[PDB]
Amino acid sequence: MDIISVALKRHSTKAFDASKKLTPEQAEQIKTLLQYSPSSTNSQPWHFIVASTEEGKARVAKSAAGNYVFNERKMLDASHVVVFCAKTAMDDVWLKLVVDQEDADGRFATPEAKAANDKGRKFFADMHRKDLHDDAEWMAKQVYLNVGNFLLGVAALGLDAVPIEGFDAAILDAEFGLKEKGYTSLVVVPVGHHSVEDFNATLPKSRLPQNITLTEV
Amino acid sequence: MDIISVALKRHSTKAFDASKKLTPEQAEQIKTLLQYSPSSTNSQPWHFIVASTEEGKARVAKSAAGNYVFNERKMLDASHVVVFCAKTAMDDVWLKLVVDQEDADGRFATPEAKAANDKGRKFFADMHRKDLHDDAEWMAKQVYLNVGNFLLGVAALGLDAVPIEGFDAAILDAEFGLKEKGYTSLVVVPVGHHSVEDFNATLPKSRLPQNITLTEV
Numbered sequence A, B: 001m002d003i004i005s006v007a008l009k010r011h012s013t014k015a016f017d018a019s020k021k022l023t024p025e026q027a028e029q030i031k032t033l034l035q036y037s038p039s040s041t042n043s044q045p046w047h048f049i050v051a052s053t054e055e056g057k058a059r060v061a062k063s064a065a066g067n068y069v070f071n072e073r074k075m076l077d078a079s080h081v082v083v084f085c086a087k088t089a090m091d092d093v094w095l096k097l098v099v100d101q102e103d104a105d106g107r108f109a110t111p112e113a114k115a116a117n118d119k120g121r122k123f124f125a126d127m128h129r130k131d132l133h134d135d136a137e138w139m140a141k142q143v144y145l146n147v148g149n150f151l152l153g154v155a156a157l158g159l160d161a162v163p164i165e166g167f168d169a170a171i172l173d174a175e176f177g178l179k180e181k182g183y184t185s186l187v188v189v190p191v192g193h194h195s196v197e198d199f200n201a202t203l204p205k206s207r208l209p210q211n212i213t214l215t216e217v
């Protein structure tokens, strides 16, 4: 159970074995990972859809019918398929909700601590929706962080997965009633076990040398 | 069971033990982690700065001014500090860097297949920097994905870390001459070991209930 090995061994599955499914335990482990991911000020500006039924994966895959047909198969054949969603705008409600939760779990000693945490959360939230007018992308950024967390996490569970950015968010939004609830699709991640039609399992892993992307000071 | 415990036990350390440094192997491991993270089309539109010296860390801490004082401590007290940077504009010279390392690592069986990815990568990049004119946030989204992978990874190594968004991007960029190289800092991640002053090490992890963030279908 060494994380580097799993980091060097994991890959983007290009073909899933429709027959091999997720344990009801692994199915639970998948939702736990999504939920427990960190976020700026613990804003958790996301929403997830975890397709488990063929009727569900088809609903999702329905967004890959365009010029992303090669992606369609990964969706339908994989055990579970999660489509990460980000909030469209950071509202005062979601903010009150987060702090009310942190309080419910006992993260505040005095009511003054609770207030100081809320003012700090609103400081950052405001500099985004009021100063820089980027709360939508700031929120989308955290969702991606959640994905990086997820990809490594499932890989460490001995599961295969692949981050799909090639899909019509517009079609997916409409198909699930998103945007109405204040959300958008950003990444689709089919999870399960790979089949022999997956070429990327035999191919070596590649990244640019550290002498180009990294500076030590 | 394995990464899940890691995921639920990890926390945003608020105070570091300066004397507690990373072991020689741990230092190489965090670097590997930064390197093998996935990214859309394997574009790796990122750059990292790892400060391990006392001089390096102070230079990064320079960005912890104004209303970001509460983060200066962690940037100096932590064993190593990683500055996550994204490219400011995706140019063909880099798309050529990626494809050349993929060809060199032995992923392409036929020269037709290499030209097949170059086109795939280009088409994806083209619709971002031309049509939507948002390649700056697209590359930035990839960096956050890398951070998520990093946060869980260092935690799996038994290391402490806190993702910092509270710093001055201009000071960090200027202090390192990033704009001229084509980069901008997004997230700062000091990593080492927590001190007993870390009030967050003993506090309970708070997250929203799954009945709000997750829709199982």
Ligand SMILES: Cc1cc2nc3c(=O)[nH]c(=O)nc-3n(C[C@H](O)[C@H](O)[C@H](O)COP(=O)(O)O)c2cc1C
Pocket (backbone or CB within 6 Å): A037, A038, A039, A040, A041, A042, A145, B010, B011, B012, B014, B071, B162, B163, B164, B165, B166, B167, B187, B205
């Ligand atoms: C992108 C990002 C930026 C953050 N910025 C800061 C920061 O500037 N300073 C800090 O002390 N914590 C920062 N946090 C830590 C969050 O408050 C923390 O991740 C969140 O409350 C969840 O707590 P946990 O990491 O203990 O699970 C940041 C987290 C993320 C993901």
Ligand SMILES: Cc1cc2nc3c(=O)[nH]c(=O)nc-3n(C[C@H](O)[C@H](O)[C@H](O)COP(=O)(O)O)c2cc1C
Pocket (backbone or CB within 6 Å): A010, A011, A012, A014, A071, A162, A163, A164, A165, A166, A167, A187, A205, B036, B037, B038, B039, B040, B041, B042, B145
């Ligand atoms: C955000 C994102 C989007 C990607 N889009 C796709 C996609 O639509 N289809 C696909 O097969 N792979 C996709 N990839 C997988 C990448 O090509 C892959 O992560 C990269 O080549 C590095 O290889 P690895 O995943 O084996 O480490 C994507 C990856 C990420 C992180």
